[PDB]
Amino acid sequence: LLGIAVSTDYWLYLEEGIILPQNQSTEVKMSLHSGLWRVCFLAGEERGRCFTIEYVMESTVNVLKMIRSATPFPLVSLFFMFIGFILSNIGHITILAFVSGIFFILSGLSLVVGLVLYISSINDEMLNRTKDAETY
Amino acid sequence: KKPQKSKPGVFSFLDPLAYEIWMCIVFAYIGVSVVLFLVSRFSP
Amino acid sequence: KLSEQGVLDKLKNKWWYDKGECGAKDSGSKEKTSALSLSNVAGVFYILV
């Protein structure tokens, strides 16, 4: 599941638009699903750019700059499972299996810190959006 | 620019107490344990 | 002739009152407190893990 979890551009959701007060449905201005490597837009001018973050393009850009801070701990998470997965097979072919279980334990400690850095930095720019009445 | 809610730091949970009080808690924590050890020394 | 009775003055009362206000109207009851963020208590997890 983690290889699927890293490789997709569907880690989160975003919808920035402006509302209409008097009994009228909302007008979406920007909407996109994204990941960490590529970003594939959904409703920004109806543009199909599966677009990297190192290239720019106004607030969701700076949101995307903070997801670069959430990079390393999912990448470290892959290596400790993969060492622990193959050492479970070499122990079948013990200490080969015991320490590999610790690499499964040391993995998920980085999963939490990975989810700590991910969710809290989103909550940073969640409030750091300039709050207007019309912009839902 | 009129400020909105500023971002709290990672050590913002200990905000409602000063640094001296948290410090005086720890030095209270040490010596009371020393007293408990020393009372337990001079008593069966 | 303007300053002796305040045509400068009384019109400066009106045009500076005219365009709406942004004062104590929204400091008092245009807020409701929210749920805590994780970022309010994130550093405990850093102390935890």
Side-chain angles (χ1 to χ4, degrees), chain A residues 42-116:
Chain A
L42 193 152
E45 295 94 7
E46 191 66 28
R47 184 66 178 169
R49 287 180 293 175
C50 285
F51 181 73
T52 60
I53 302 170
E54 191 270 332
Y55 295 99
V56 185
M57 296 182 288
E58 66 273 14
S59 67
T60 65
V61 178
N62 208 167
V63 176
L64 280 172
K65 298 298 290 294
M66 297 300 107
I67 303 169
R68 188 177 176 88
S69 178
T71 301
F73 292 100
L75 298 176
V76 179
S77 298
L78 181 63
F79 289 163
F80 287 160
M81 298 184 294
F82 186 75
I83 292 170
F85 182 71
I86 193 66
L87 266 293
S88 65
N89 291 318
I90 302 168
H92 296 170
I93 299 299
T94 60
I95 300 296
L96 298 173
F98 177 72
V99 182
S100 69
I102 301 170
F103 287 109
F104 285 163
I105 291 169
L106 293 171
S107 69
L109 298 175
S110 178
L111 268 297
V112 175
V113 177
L115 291 174
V116 165

Side-chain angles (χ1 to χ4, degrees), chain B residues 21-40:
Chain B
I21 301 171
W22 292 102
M23 187 178 289
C24 289
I25 287 168
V26 177
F27 288 101
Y29 177 76
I30 295 168
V32 169
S33 296
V34 175
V35 170
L36 291 174
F37 181 72
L38 266 295
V39 168
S40 179

Side-chain angles (χ1 to χ4, degrees), chain A residues 109 113 116-117 119-120 123, chain C residues 37-39 42 45-46 49:
Chain A
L109 298 175
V113 177
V116 165
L117 269 300
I119 296 168
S120 64
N123 292 319
Chain C
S37 70
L38 184 63
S39 297
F45 293 93
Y46 292 98
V49 181

Side-chain angles (χ1 to χ4, degrees), chain C residues 17-28:
Chain C
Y17 181 77
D18 186 75
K19 279 82 168 183
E21 293 177 353
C22 184
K25 58 173 70 175
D26 55 354
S27 295

Side-chain angles (χ1 to χ4, degrees), chain C:
Chain C
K1 291 194 286 182
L2 296 174
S3 68
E4 62 185 1
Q5 64 180 355
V7 182
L8 291 168
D9 296 329
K10 183 67 175 67
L11 291 174
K12 190 171 72 174
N13 298 324
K14 187 255 289 184
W15 292 99
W16 278 256
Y17 181 77
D18 186 75
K19 279 82 168 183
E21 293 177 353
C22 184
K25 58 173 70 175
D26 55 354
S27 295
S29 296
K30 292 294 188 296
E31 75 273 17
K32 74 282 190 186
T33 181
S34 296
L36 290 176
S37 70
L38 184 63
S39 297
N40 294 114
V41 293
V44 183
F45 293 93
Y46 292 98
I47 293 173
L48 182 61
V49 181

